[PDB]
Write a protein that binds this ligand. Structure first.
Ligand SMILES: CCCCCCCCCCCCCCCCCC(=O)OC[C@H](COP(=O)([O-])OCC(O)COP(=O)([O-])OC[C@@H](COC(=O)CCCCCCCCCCCCCCCCC)OC(=O)CCCCCCCCCCCCCCCCC)OC(=O)CCCCCCCCCCCCCCCCC
Ligand SMILES: CCCCCCCCCCCCCCCCCC(=O)OC[C@H](COP(=O)([O-])OCC(O)COP(=O)([O-])OC[C@@H](COC(=O)CCCCCCCCCCCCCCCCC)OC(=O)CCCCCCCCCCCCCCCCC)OC(=O)CCCCCCCCCCCCCCCCC
Ligand SMILES: COC1=C(OC)C(=O)C(C/C=C(/C)CC/C=C(/C)CC/C=C(/C)CC/C=C(\C)CC/C=C(\C)CC/C=C(\C)CC/C=C(/C)CC/C=C(/C)CC/C=C(/C)CCC=C(C)C)=C(C)C1=O
Ligand SMILES: COC1=C(OC)C(=O)C(C/C=C(/C)CC/C=C(/C)CC/C=C(/C)CC/C=C(\C)CC/C=C(\C)CC/C=C(\C)CC/C=C(/C)CC/C=C(/C)CC/C=C(/C)CCC=C(C)C)=C(C)C1=O
Ligand SMILES: CCCCCCCCCCCCCCCCC[C@@H](O)O[C@H](CO[C@H](O)CCCCCCCCCCCCCCC)COP(=O)(O)OCC[N+](C)(C)C
Ligand SMILES: CCCCCCCCCCCCCCCCC[C@@H](O)O[C@H](CO[C@H](O)CCCCCCCCCCCCCCC)COP(=O)(O)OCC[N+](C)(C)C
Ligand SMILES: CCCCCCCC/C=C\CCCCCCCC(=O)OC[C@H](COP(=O)(O)OCCN)OC(=O)CCCCCCC/C=C\CCCCCCCC
Ligand SMILES: CCCCCCCC/C=C\CCCCCCCC(=O)OC[C@H](COP(=O)(O)OCCN)OC(=O)CCCCCCC/C=C\CCCCCCCC
Ligand SMILES: CCCCCCCC/C=C\CCCCCCCC(=O)OC[C@H](COP(=O)(O)OCCN)OC(=O)CCCCCCC/C=C\CCCCCCCC
Ligand code: SF4
Ligand code: SF4
Ligand code: SF4
Lengths: 171, 70, 318, 176, 96, 215, 115, 156
């Protein structure tokens, strides 16, 4: 997640469609997003780390969120009304397939649907950002710099610590 | 350049000719070629309505000549 | 078939605006010892097409602090009113024959100011707001004088029908009867179209881009198109009102050609005036309209009421 | 010795008052301005047809730098570094050493053209007419790095523009 | 006097090598003047002269359509002039 | 901003369109020139004065050269002094053209700018002929001038001067008696002689209030 | 009927122009690009703050002078009445009072903007 | 093929429209703005190429950085560059904007405007003559002519 990302931006972008379609209302999906700057710093550190030659790293954020809670926090930071509704897998796959016909960059695809409504694997045996010296930056300290662009003029000057950090599924 | 400004003014003049001439030609085409009738007042509208009824083809512009009075 | 007439009125006006851009640029260039565009096409003919294509392929901008509904409505209202102001003009047959044509022009002209007002307010910027308030002041300056001038001139016409103005001037132009009113009307039309020396709302030296500072690409282009179309329409109205061409009922082409030539003469006069003079202060414009134009307008309105009665020259068509 | 610019008052003659009233009511001065601008409309414009026509220049014109040679093809520069010491912008960097034949010649000669102010002090300082400012001025590039000249580029500039640089020097060296 | 400037325009059309050459120069150089040919270049450029023009228009070049490796029919630039004609064309000398 | 001369950040407080306070923020073109001069020799520091007031180059060179000549206790030769005064007057013409035309452009008279910048271009040609640079010259040095005048320059200067008065006349025809121009300029920015003297004014800023002073 | 069609055509053409302008080009909007425009820097206050109006007195008078137009526009038809002497007396009366109201506001310094 | 021919023709039309209508921002800093003004003067007549100054950045196609960029002005230059709707181009004019020039070692000067904004054309000089800037502008026009946006889109 970052300024030019398709994650925080993607969820914010679906506000126009009146409601927020979520498979099973986003209560059976867990996400662990990671900051873009943390990934870049980890790549740079892996470049100049002799011990990281033939290793495999998992770059994950410090917190795991349920998809419903994550989208609710996204809409709360953007100060938009949140109107989620459940959608079956077949119908929402169908609308993804319908969007796929765009000759330009598609708004969403079936594969994007699958990835969005897929829980994040937990691989504790793999090295992470803490093994490259990177302390993962939580979403709460960096969501405003992405989602302030999605606010209206009324809420444009709202500060960072005003939007009640989201509920976390931490172990 | 000064006569090189003339092509642009000529193109503007040609563009500005089209509205009036097209309007006049369309008025003549849809009124039997006789300068579409003007009705500022109710008397002229009554005249057009009477003409529309008399012709029998439901058109005001089809004038009925003295030959219609046997 | 009537839709064909609407299209044949609309499209040529847009093309004429596009090439008035070129004509203004070239006239100002040659009046400034340079040439103006000659490189794009033969004699700069393709320059308007290049500008139009460049603008409509450029990304439109929506300000973060702007209220989007009015931001989008304002250029649409401007362009639509600019196109609507053309339908009652007799060249020599109007597209829409109105019994009160001059009143219709006055009303649509008054409504056309809200384009500038709403664009300046919805931009949510200080320069745009300053331009909008300058538009308010300009309208307050010119409106009453313009209406009284129109009334005084049309008192010799006998009605508000624009087609009757041709019959009024079968033998003489009304500029020989009301040239002082013609002068004040010309200045009022300069002030009404936001043209130099009264281009206060844009205020280029003073306020950067003024009211349309925020606007970019196609939306900006629409405002520009509307401004030029209003220029041409007001000069056509001035030509009909004060320089009456001779209309042959069996050959309207002569009237159309003579009308177009007079309209072009008046538009080039606007370009000339822009090239010759500096800019007023908008408080000085109000004092000019309320302390110089208004007293003469009232005196000449009384004079033009009294003249037909004491002369036994009252026009027909009560 | 001084003169006044705006201390004249107008006559109160009846016809003078009438003339001023006619000017106020009939806008005669504005018509005079319109006449001036109309007279300019009918004059020939001063525009030239670039790039097919060029503005006039002079032999003294300072343009793109170049390193020159002697008629035999030997370089003129002897690495005295007077141009480097005089450069107001410190745009010249020079390194030297004895050549294989023992000649005193540079091994590095760079000019940063994004530092250079095109003052020509370097060619006034040079005792052998090695470095000059040529007549070329149409050498805009698409990257910053292309304006960091080294010795190869400057020697190539000299070889390219010698036929004109020599003629410009021939027409002006008697003023120097 | 008007008929004479019309004759001059017609002569300009004729002296460019017919209508095709007239259109070619009008769409390449954006100018239809005719002057005495001072000389031709090693690469195809032609240099004309007209001393009755004011200072700045009295000399010009009609660029070649084919420089070292590229087609310069539309894409021309001032860097295509060799140094000797560069000196003549910028009025640093009176000698071609 | 078109009327901000490029690098002026004017912070104004306004009630309506009325001006309550002007707070000019400068330094957006502060290049630390005085410090650099301390790191150069006297000859190397001369182009800085070209670049100081880039509308009057020869005059800045002349002032710097006069200061350095005063410190050196030397004297420029007579022909050098005559050349200096000639090109100083040409530079005055250039600067006054720029000032008047840009002032008219800011007020709204867009036309005389183009008429007068042709004369400015011809004077740039004079600069380039005598030195090789259109505006940054560096012709005036602290011992005299760099090179002698080319053999045809005085004739061309005479040709330009015998025609420039008509251009000034056309300028005055456009502006002097115009009632719009007078309304925009008359009784605007009125400064008293005593305030002008105290506030450190000089030049036309002093002579407009009636102070009879000229260096 | 025809005026409705004309208005619909004009509005639809303008709307299609806006639609083309907004959906044809490549949009790339980021927070810095859409920020409010001051000349170089960020604005101090808001454009929604009160903006003082120095010609407030002339604006109110414009309302009263505007309605004097509604009283004078039927004058071309009033000239066709039989009794012209009472019409001309009333029309001149309606303009003398309009002139006297302008004179009153002028002399009492009502036409000058607030300083 | 047929689609590639269509996209090539559309590239030609779009690039022609874009290069023929280049509207620079009314933006200038120092010495070089005078030569830019002289390019706007009747002798060179930048208008005749389709190039006209416009004050608002939202109505600008090109930014010409003509003069010294100082540390105090760099945020303002970046701000007015970011508010230009794309496509946008930057021309660097003179030594000061190219690499710092004659104030390169100053404490208050940005050593080249390309540290702040990406630059398309570097015009060298102090100041570049009006023909030098005209050559740079026409070079930018040729560069715009050479770009292939829909050919690359069609081959994605
Ligand atoms: C039902 C009752 C009648 C409804 C009227 C129209 C239907 C409303 C549908 C949506 C319209 C507005 C969309 C919107 O708010 O943003 C969407 C969307 C959301 O973006 P956002 O940034 O997240 O929103 C920012 C904030 O939410 C805050 O955004 P904001 O601050 O910009 O919101 C302002 C907006 C929000 O409005 C609202 O709050 C709710 C809408 C109710 C408005 C109705 C009020 C009644 C006013 C008088 C009656 C008007 C005529 C009604 C006709 C109905 C009968 C058929 O207010 C208006 O739109 C009012 C203008 C509408 C009047 C149009 C009349 C033209 C006048 C021309 C002169 C007349 C000449 C004489 C004749 O914005 C866009 O995507 C951009 C395009 C949308 C705007 C385009 C132009 C407006 C739509 C045309 C209306 C139809 C005219 C025919
Ligand atoms: C509408 C009335 C047009 C009457 C007219 O064009 O005569 C202007 C003709 C222009 O003379 P001028 O520009 O004062 O003298 C410059 C030399 O004749 C300069 O002569 P030049 O050697 O440049 O002549 C080149 C030649 C060829 O020039 C061209 O083909 C390029 C312009 C073509 C435009 C189409 O120009 C013409 O002969 C065409 C004259 C205008 C025809 C349109 O003199 C008049 O007839 C003035 C009559 C009063 C007009 C108000
Ligand atoms: C960050 O990138 C992204 C984009 O780029 C900027 C997108 O457009 C995008 C899709 C969003 C679009 C911009 C759509 C915006 C316009 C509307 C949503 C179109 C749908 C509205 C209706 C058609 C209204 C019609 C009226 C009804 C009654 C029917 C997404 C998801 C995205 O993520
Ligand atoms: C002192 O400098 C200045 C100038 O002088 C050089 C100017 O000219 C000038 C005026 C601006 C010019 C650059 C003119 C700009 C030209 C327009 C913006 C182009 C508008 C043309 C189109 C949008 C019209 C539509 C195009 C179609 C071909 C018309 C037909 C429509 C179809 C539906 C059919 C300004 C503001 C200025 O400041
Ligand atoms: C239908 C609405 C959408 C399209 C609207 C289009 C409007 C009409 C199109 C305008 C046509 C004009 C373009 C052609 C003019 C180019 C002139 C010529 O010189 O181009 C040469 C090269 O050819 C052009 O690049 C061709 C460009 C046009 C390509 C074909 C146009 C295809 C039109 C397709 C429109 C379809 C759109 C419909 C979509 C709904 C290079 O010129 P150049 O040298 O630089 O210019 C002068 C500089 N000099 C002095 C050095 C010479
Ligand atoms: C008697 C004591 C009065 C004291 C109170 C004074 C206060 C009021 C001011 C004067 C009274 C106004 C009465 C006028 C009533 C109008 C009707 C009458 O006067 O006849 C009219 C005569 O017309 C005259 O013009 C009357 C008006 C003349 C007075 C000018 C106005 C000045 C009044 C002062 C107050 C205005 C305030 C501003 C001061 C300037 C019309 O006659 P005519 O047209 O045949 O018939 C029409 C019917 N038709 C159609 C069948 C033919
Ligand atoms: C083709 C698809 C049509 C979809 C229209 C959606 C309109 C909308 O609200 O969305 C915003 C939309 C597109 O912007 P983006 O979403 O940022 O771009 C996405 C593509 N890259 O903005 C617009 O285009 C708005 C254009 C206006 C649409 C037309 C409707 C306007 C109606 C106004 C009528 C009122 C006029 C009153 C005056 C007349 C009175 C006499
Ligand atoms: C916007 C303001 C609308 C102005 C309408 C003016 C039309 C007009 O004056 O034409 C006159 C014409 C005929 O009158 P005469 O001049 O006497 O000549 C015919 C008699 N022989 O009148 C008509 O045709 C009336 C027909 C219907 C009236 C038009 C109503 C239009 C109202 C506009 C509303 C816009 C849409 C509604 C909401 C918009 C935004 C939410
Ligand atoms: C009223 C005056 C103007 C008239 C209004 C319409 C003019 C019509 C002219 C048509 C010219 C063709 C327009 C092509 C340019 C469109 C915008 C553009 O250039 O986008 C390029 C874009 C870049 O995408 P990517 O490379 O994949 O991503 C890069 C970003 N990371 O490529 C595209 O998507 C181009 C798609 C083709 C556009 C279709 C054009 C067809 C003609 C439509 C004309 C409409 C008129 C009605
Ligand atoms: S011209 Fe001046 S700044 Fe440039 S290299 Fe020579 S001495 Fe240095
Ligand atoms: S170019 Fe000339 S001054 Fe510079 S090092 Fe070589 S010989 Fe010496
Ligand atoms: S490059 Fe030279 S002329 Fe241009 S701004 Fe810098 S110092 Fe001044």
């Amino acid at each position: 997640f970052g300024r030019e990302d398709r994650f925080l931006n993607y969820f914010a972008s679906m506000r126009w469609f009146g409601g927020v379609p979520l498979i099973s209302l986003g209560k059976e999906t867990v996400k662990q997003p990671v900051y873009i700057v943390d990934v870049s710093k980890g790549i740079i550190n892996a470049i100049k780390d002799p011990d990281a030659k033939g290793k495999t790293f998992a770059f994950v954020g410090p917190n795991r969120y349920l998809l419903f809670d994550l989208v609710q926090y996204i809409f709360a930071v953007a100060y938009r009304p949140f109107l989620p509704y459940p959608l079956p897998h077949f119908a929402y796959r169908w609308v993804g397939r319908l969007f796929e016909v765009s000759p330009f960059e598609p708004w969403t695809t079936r594969d994007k649907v699958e990835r969005v409504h897929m829980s994040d694997m937990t691989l504790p045996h793999l090295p992470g950002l803490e093994d490259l010296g990177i302390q993962a930056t939580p979403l709460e300290l960096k969501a405003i710099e992405v989602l302030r662009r999605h606010r209206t003029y009324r809420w444009l000057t709202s500060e960072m610590e005003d939007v009640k950090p989201a509920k976390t599924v931490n172990i | 350049m000064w006569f090189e400004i003339l092509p642009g003014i000529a193109v503007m003049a040609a563009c500005l000719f089209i509205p009036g001439m097209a309007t006049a030609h369309i008025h003549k085409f849809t009124n039997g070629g006789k300068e579409k009738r003007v009705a500022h007042f109710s008397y002229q509208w009554n005249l057009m309505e009477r003409d529309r009824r008399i012709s029998g083809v439901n058109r005001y512009h089809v004038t009925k000549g003295l030959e219609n009075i046997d | 078939m009537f839709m064909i007439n609407i299209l044949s009125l609309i499209i040529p006006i847009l093309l004429a605006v596009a090439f008035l851009t070129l004509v203004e640029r070239k006239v100002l260039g040659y009046m400034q010892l340079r040439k103006g565009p000659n490189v794009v096409g033969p004699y700069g003919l393709l320059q308007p097409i290049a500008d139009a294509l460049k603008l409509f392929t450029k990304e439109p901008l929506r300000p973060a602090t702007s209220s989007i509904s009015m931001f989008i409505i304002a250029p649409i209202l401007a362009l639509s009113l600019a196109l609507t102001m053309w339908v009652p003009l007799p060249m020599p047959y109007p597209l829409i024959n109105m019994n009160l044509g001059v009143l219709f022009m006055l009303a649509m002209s008054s409504l056309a100011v809200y384009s500038i007002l709403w664009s300046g307010w919805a931009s949510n910027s200080k320069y745009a707001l300053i331009g909008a308030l300058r538009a308010v002041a300009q309208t307050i300056s010119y409106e009453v004088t313009l209406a009284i001038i129109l009334l005084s001139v049309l008192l010799m016409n006998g009605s508000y029908t624009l087609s009757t103005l041709i019959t009024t001037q079968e033998h003489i132009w009304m500029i020989f009867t009301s040239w002082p009113l013609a002068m004040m009307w010309f200045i009022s039309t300069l002030a009404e179209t936001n043209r130099a020396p009264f281009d206060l709302t844009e205020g280029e030296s003073e306020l950067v881009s003024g009211f349309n500072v925020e606007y970019a690409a196609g939306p900006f282009a629409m405002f520009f198109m509307a401004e030029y179309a209003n220029i041409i329409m007001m000069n056509a109205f001035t030509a009909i009102l004060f320089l009456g061409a001779s209309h042959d009922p069996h050959t309207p082409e002569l009237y159309t050609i003579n009308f177009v030539l007079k309209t072009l003469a008046l538009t080039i006069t606007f370009l000339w005036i822009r090239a010759s003079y500096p800019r007023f202060r908008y408080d000085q414009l109000m004092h000019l309209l309320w302390k110089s134009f208004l007293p003469l307008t009232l005196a000449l309105c009384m004079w033009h009421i009294s003249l037909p009665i004491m002369t036994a020259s009252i026009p027909p068509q009560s | 010795t001084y003169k006044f610019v705006n201390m004249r008052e107008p006559s109160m003659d009846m016809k003078s008052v009438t003339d001023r009233a006619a000017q106020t009511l009939l806008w005669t001065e504005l018509v005079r301005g319109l006449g001036m601008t109309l007279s300019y409309l009918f004059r020939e414009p001063a525009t030239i047809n670039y790039p097919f026509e060029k503005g006039p220049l002079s032999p003294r014109f300072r343009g793109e730098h170049a390193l020159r040679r002697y008629p035999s093809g030997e370089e003129r520069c002897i690495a005295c570094k007077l141009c480097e010491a005089v450069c107001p912008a410190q745009a010249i960097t020079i390194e030297a050493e004895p050549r294989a034949d023992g000649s005193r010649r540079t091994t590095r000669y760079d000019i940063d053209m994004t530092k250079c102010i095109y003052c020509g002090f370097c060619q006034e300082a040079c005792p052998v007419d090695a470095i000059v400012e040529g007549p070329n001025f149409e050498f805009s590039t698409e990257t910053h790095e292309e304006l960091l000249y080294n010795k190869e580029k400057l020697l190539n500039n000299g070889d390219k523009w010698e036929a004109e640089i020599a003629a410009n020097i021939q027409a002006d060296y008697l003023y120097r | 006097e008007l008929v004479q400037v019309l004759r001059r325009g017609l002569q300009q059309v004729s002296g460019h090598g017919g209508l095709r050459g007239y259109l070619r120069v009008l769409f390449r150089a954006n100018d239809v003047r005719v002057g005495t040919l001072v000389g031709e270049d090693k690469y195809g450029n032609k240099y004309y002269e007209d001393n009755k023009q004011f200072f700045g228009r009295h000399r010009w070049v009609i660029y070649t359509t084919e420089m070292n490796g590229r087609d310069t029919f539309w894409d021309v630039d001032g860097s295509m002039v060799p140094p000797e004609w560069h000196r003549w064309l910028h009025c640093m000398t009176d000698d071609p | 901003h078109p009327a901000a001369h490029g690098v002026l950040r004017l912070v104004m407080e306004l009630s309506g369109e009325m001006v309550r306070k002007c707070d000019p923020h400068i330094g957006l073109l502060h290049r630390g020139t005085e410090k650099l001069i301390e790191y150069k020799t006297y000859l190397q520091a001369l182009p800085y004065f070209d670049r100081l007031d880039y509308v009057s180059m020869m005059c800045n060179e002349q002032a710097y050269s006069l200061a350095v000549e005063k410190l050196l206790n030397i004297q420029p030769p007579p022909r050098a002094q005559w050349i200096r005064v000639l090109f100083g007057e040409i530079t005055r013409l250039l600067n006054h053209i720029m000032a008047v035309t840009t002032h008219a452009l800011d007020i709204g008279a867009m036309t005389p700018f183009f008429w007068m910048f042709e004369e400015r271009e011809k004077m740039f040609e004079f600069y380039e002929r005598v030195s090789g640079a259109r505006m940054h010259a560096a012709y005036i040095r602290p011992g005299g001038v760099h090179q002698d005048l080319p053999l045809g320059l005085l004739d061309d200067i005479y040709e330009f001067s015998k025609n420039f008065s008509f251009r000034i006349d056309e300028l005055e025809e456009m502006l002097t008696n115009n009632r719009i121009w007078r309304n925009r300029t008359v009784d605007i920015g009125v400064v008293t002689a005593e305030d002008a003297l105290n506030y450190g004014f000089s030049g036309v800023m002093l002579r407009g209030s009636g102070i009879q002073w000229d260096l | 009927m025809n005026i409705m069609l004309t208005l619909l055509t004009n509005v639809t053409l303008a709307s299609l122009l806006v639609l083309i302008a907004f959906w044809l080009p490549q949009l790339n909007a980021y927070s810095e690009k859409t920020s409010p425009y001051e000349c170089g820097f960020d604005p101090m206050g808001s454009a929604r703050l009160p903006f003082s109006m120095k010609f407030f007195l002339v604006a109110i008078t414009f309302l009263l002078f505007d309605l004097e137009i509604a009283l004078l526009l039927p004058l071309p038809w009033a000239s066709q009445t039989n009794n012209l002497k009472t019409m001309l007396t009333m029309a001149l009366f309606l303009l003398i009072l309009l002139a006297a109201s302008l004179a009153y506001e002028w002399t009492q310094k009502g036409l000058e903007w607030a300083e | 093929s047929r689609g590639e021919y269509v996209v090539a023709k559309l590239d030609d039309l779009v690039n022609w429209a874009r290069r023929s209508s280049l509207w620079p921002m009314t933006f200038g800093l120092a010495c070089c703005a005078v030569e830019m003004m002289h390019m706007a003067a009747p002798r060179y007549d930048m208008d005749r190429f389709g190039v006209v100054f416009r004050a608002s950045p939202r109505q600008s196609d090109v930014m010409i950085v003509a003069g010294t960029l100082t540390n105090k002005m760099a945020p303002a230059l970046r701000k007015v560059y970011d508010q230009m709707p794309e496509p946008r181009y930057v021309v660097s004019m003179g030594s000061c904007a190219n690499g710092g020039g004659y104030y390169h070692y100053s404490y208050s000067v940005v050593r080249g405007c390309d540290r702040i904004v990406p630059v398309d054309i570097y015009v060298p000089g102090c100041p570049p003559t009006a023909e030098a800037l005209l050559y740079g502008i026409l070079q930018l026009q040729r560069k715009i002519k050479r770009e292939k946006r829909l050919r690359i889109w069609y081959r994605r």
